[PDB]
Design a protein around this ligand. Structure first.
Ligand SMILES: Nc1ncnc2c1ncn2[C@@H]1O[C@H](CO)[C@@H](O)[C@H]1O
Ligand SMILES: Nc1ncnc2c1ncn2[C@@H]1O[C@H](CO)[C@@H](O)[C@H]1O
Ligand SMILES: Cc1cn([C@H]2C[C@H](O)[C@@H](CO)O2)c(=O)[nH]c1=O
Ligand SMILES: Cc1cn([C@H]2C[C@H](O)[C@@H](CO)O2)c(=O)[nH]c1=O
Ligand SMILES: Cc1cn([C@H]2C[C@H](O)[C@@H](CO)O2)c(=O)[nH]c1=O
Ligand SMILES: [K+]
Ligand SMILES: [K+]
Lengths: 330, 330
């Protein structure tokens, strides 16, 4: 028996969510649909301009871990909060979902990371993230027994921003592979890819990462191309398995020369796209560690992602397992 | 001109919201549909048993003030938070809505009040409130110039639980009436009425409160009767104006011998009733301070209430002013 199906590792963040008009993004020089890193001063400035908000636990990998547990898989998470009220919210929410979460805060300062997420009328989300205590995640936070006893360890490209998180990830890759497990990453964001393109390619080509998640824009950014067919050909050459999401066009799963196209589910409306990619990874990795086919992995991914975009908040409030049973994916 | 249409005064609370099954309430001895006061230990305990949650600024009177501002009225609020992250959330949300809010925190202990609100499948809400910093609200928090410059000062029955808040309210009543303004209260909760029945009747009969809000169960509780018609007759005898809500049956406005019945909005699905009474008061008081007929005040209250119960969270995220325009209430 393996204690865990999926361990995820990421920036532990609490989301502060508000709807805005299109001009708000322009007026405030916020790059639409992207993750915009901000300092403490800018965080205070943007917050002062933000309307009344809602808070919900976030963090890309955090959401993925939660989604896996929701579907019924066994999940763990590494990510660093502060000993403050926001960190207590993050800690509660992830543990309440049944995710193993044992990363110890180092003190109250820097405070727990938060992301001000502005949702436009089209349902797109634009994130403004102060990393706070996420900068203290390092090799000391690697629970070696957890990595050794997890079928897949999945991590965010976003971890390349804080200074020492990469060292933790390299330790994870070593332990995971020594114990016959698989490593996975998400490219996270097209600008994050712009920042760490060479390093991400090295992770894939050195075999430190076995399974890569990307959306269309990230895959284009990885190879600095406008040719999507080139991007798919190259990503398939650079990693063992690639899962590439294409928004309303669903996704394509790649393994060597194999290609499996999956449709997006029918949706009422795009309420808020926050979490779509994360929950795609949840569905995929749940299916994968249940020994399902790559196509059914894609189907589970598209189901989980389709559900999350129909609600405010990055973690489905409804039962994904029930949804999966209802959709005949079981 | 008057600087403010409506000042509200209440327990400043951040809500922590989760959906639960019916049995959860029974297993944890939570009185359904009521405000259950809890101590710090019980707060920790219930939180440990609560699923993943969302946080949103709450507090009955806070919600009401926010509602008035959303409608286009000029609102102010008195309520005490702590110097902590929950308090910063509370402060941001209310100020961001355009409500004057200048109550100063006194320290970091007790921490900002929070209420764990469990929403059952029927849309009913059961609140479990640790008062925290609210126990510090007192006469020192009365901005006398604001009370003098507000057409109506409205407060919670809930304020009779913390020790010194009633002193602040008596100060408000004196100032309001000396400047020819009106005082209003809500009965808040039927168990709250059970606790403070005599005191609430005294507030009305002595003329300290001019306008009273009640729902059916509060009105029945106030006179310890099963006869709603008796409760209406008696409440009208006890205060100048009474606004009595009847859930899906709308509301009735009473003044002397005058009665004005108003229909409820027909509801698709009741998502979460949290805030319904609060937003009824927003609409009513907005209409009242705009010189509208009592019926129209009731219509505006029912409009705002119907809106809030169709969303998660106690403060409408949509434009109430726009909704009022569409409804010809303007
Ligand atoms: N720099 C970051 N690293 C990891 N996750 C992030 C970052 N910024 C925003 N997020 C999270 O991305 C999620 C949506 O993918 C949101 O819930 C938000 O918390
Ligand atoms: N003791 C209390 N005093 C004032 N408001 C409260 C109390 N308990 C819960 N609430 C608020 O009641 C609101 C719903 O009417 C919620 O937003 C919640 O914050
Ligand atoms: C219908 C739909 C699905 N999704 C799902 C399917 C994608 O593979 C996933 C990641 O974007 O989210 C959208 O993102 N947008 C949509 O409009
Ligand atoms: C006003 C205040 C009260 N308290 C304590 C004293 C009481 O035990 C409790 C309720 O007033 O809070 C503080 O710890 N710090 C403060 O600043
Ligand atoms: C419970 C409920 C309340 N309401 C509105 C009308 C009431 O006057 C107000 C307070 O309960 O909320 C509805 O419109 N429909 C409902 O089902
Ligand atoms: K969402
Ligand atoms: K609500």
């Amino acid at each position: 028996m393996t204690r865990f199906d999926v361990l995820t590792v990421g920036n532990a963040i609490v989301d502060i969510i508000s709807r805005c008009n299109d001009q708000f993004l322009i007026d405030n020089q916020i790059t639409k649909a992207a993750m915009n890193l901000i300092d403490a001063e800018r965080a205070e400035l943007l917050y002062s301009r933000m309307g009344p908000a809602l808070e919900a636990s976030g963090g890309s990998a955090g959401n993925t871990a939660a989604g896996v547990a929701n579907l019924g898989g066994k999940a763990a998470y590494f990510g660093n909060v502060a000993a403050d009220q926001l960190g207590d919210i993050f800690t509660h929410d992830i543990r309440a979902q049944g995710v193993h979460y044992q990363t110890k805060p180092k003190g109250a300062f820097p405070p727990t990371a938060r992301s001000m997420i502005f949702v436009t009328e089209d349902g797109e989300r634009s994130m403004n993230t102060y990393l706070g205590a996420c900068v203290e995640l390092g090799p000391e936070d690697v629970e070696a027994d957890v990595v050794a006893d997890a079928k897949v360890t999945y991590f965010e490209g976003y971890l390349w921003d804080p200074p020492r998180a990469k060292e933790a990830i390299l330790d994870c890759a070593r332990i995971a592979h020594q114990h016959g497990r698989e490593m996975s990453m998400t490219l996270s964001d097209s600008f994050c890819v712009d920042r760490y393109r060479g390093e991400f390619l090295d992770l894939m080509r050195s075999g430190k990462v076995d399974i890569v998640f990307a959306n269309r824009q990230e895959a284009l950014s990885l190879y600095q191309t406008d040719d999507f067919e080139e991007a798919l050909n190259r990503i398939a050459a650079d990693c063992k398995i690639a899962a590439v999401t294409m928004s309303e066009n669903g996704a394509v799963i790649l393994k060597g020369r194999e290609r499996y196209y999956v449709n997006a589910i029918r949706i009422r409306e795009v309420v808020d796209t926050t979490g779509a990619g994360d929950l795609f990874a949840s569905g995929f990795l749940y299916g994968y560690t249940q020994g399902r086919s790559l196509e059914d992995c894609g189907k589970l991914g598209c189901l989980a992602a389709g559900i999350v975009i129909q609600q405010i908040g990055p973690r489905p409030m409804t039962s994904l397992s029930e949804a999966a049973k209802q959709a005949g994916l079981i």
